């Protein structure tokens with residue numbers, strides 16, 4: 001049990017940001033894929049899940065649930081959480097904006113069909129007018145290669161992950177954000193992240209209809 | 222030196238857990254209330270809001286947005302975030318469960334009238350069968366006065382705040398969790414918290430009709 005062990009169903013979902021961070025940190029992990037409501041109930045009954053939910057990661061003797069608890073620990077453990085409390089505040093402020101946007105995109109597929117169009121348009125408007133400007137502005141103001149402390153952090157990893165999902169959405173959205181483009185390229189070419197982006201890795205594909213129906217079967221929603 | 226300043230409207234909303242945490246830490250703070258969309262637009266134009274939203278807290282030379290960024294910083298600063306990353310992992314796991322429940326309760330008032338009762342019922346069920354059981358188990362597990370590290374942390378503060386909102390919802394819900402009942406009593410009698418719970422503190426009341434209108438008008442939803 002040297003490898004962290006990720007419990008989740010076979011999809012990006014709430015576990016993918018953790019997959020990215022671990023990979024960018026060069027940490028190898030195992031994944032135990034939930035395939036059925038029965039598998040989830042198994043974990044639930046063996047007392048593995050504090051709030052009866054996944055994501056859960058077995059790491060360092062712990063059974064960590066809650067996405068942010070997992071990410072925070074992993075980021076600290078591998079020195080990707082800034083150097084002090086004030087760097088951490090910037091990292092936290094940045095990645096919480098990223099989380100807000102990411103949550104909107106993550107849930108788009110379960111928007112009621114009569115709300116789907118307006119929600120997509122809202123997401124595009126916020127990307128254009130709120131989130132991309134905010135992060136371009138940060139890069140522009142210190143001119144450095146990384147978001148915080150002139151050094152690779154979880155913030156660059158989380159943001160670049162999001163850039164890939166926005167590109168899947170509408171490849172034109174990032175067009176007028178040169179600094180964001182540059183960041184995506186630099187980060188994507190880091191050896192650990194390059195390897196994750198390449199075919200064959202544990203990186204997961206966009207959720208399709210089949211996958212969405214598996215999640216409804218498993219999590220009973 | 223300079224007191225923290227809390228930028229929000231005059232309500233609990235997303236700023237109340239910050240008010241609790243600062244107050245519990247014995248930190249005096251000031252509030253600048255937003256009363257109109259025009260006040261919000263000023264903070265925006267002034268460049269004070271990274272994502273054009275509040276909560277915003279001015280603290281130690283930073284304009285901190287994002288509830289979790291704010292709370293994380295304050296928790297670390299006043300030694301309420303555990304003594305090592307393993308304790309922070311437990312704290313994070315606990316408080317993210319508290320966040321999940323708090324979010325359901327926070328947004329209850331903006332449920333459409335034909336969803337209000339169903340949603341309320343779900344909440345009560347999750348309190349009774351998922352969340353209170355988890356936190357009671359943690360307390361029963363080590364038998365100590367505080368959730369983590371045998372010492373006051375943000376987890377105790379965030380939980381007890383939540384126990385007060387649950388009491389407003391349905392005073393019977395806590396009835397079969399003696400350790401939670403006793404935690405609430407103990408934390409409520411810490412000098413700093415006791416003063417916050419007394420009249421005249423920055424502690425805010427439950428949202429009533431007018432408050433909600435002020436919120437729609439101000440934040441344009």
Ligand SMILES: N[C@@H](CCC(=O)N[C@@H](CSC(=S)NCCc1ccccc1)C(=O)NCC(=O)O)C(=O)O
Nearest residue numbers: 013014053054055066067106107109110215219321
């Ligand atoms: N705040 C928690 C949330 C955990 C959570 O919601 N877990 C889900 C599983 S996570 C999820 S549903 N993954 C897919 C998300 C998704 C669904 C549909 C379309 C797109 C994405 C779960 O366990 N449900 C069972 C239950 O609560 O009884 C966290 O961040 O870890």
Ligand SMILES: N[C@@H](CCC(=O)N[C@@H](CSC(=S)NCCc1ccccc1)C(=O)NCC(=O)O)C(=O)O
Nearest residue numbers: 100234235274275276287288327328330331436440
């Ligand atoms: N993830 C962010 C979210 C901040 C946020 O949503 N702020 C709202 C204001 S906070 C909120 S609306 N508080 C009221 C809570 C409430 C809502 C509905 C019913 C009852 C209470 C805002 O600024 N909206 C304007 C905009 O996005 O353009 C954070 O935690 O800080």
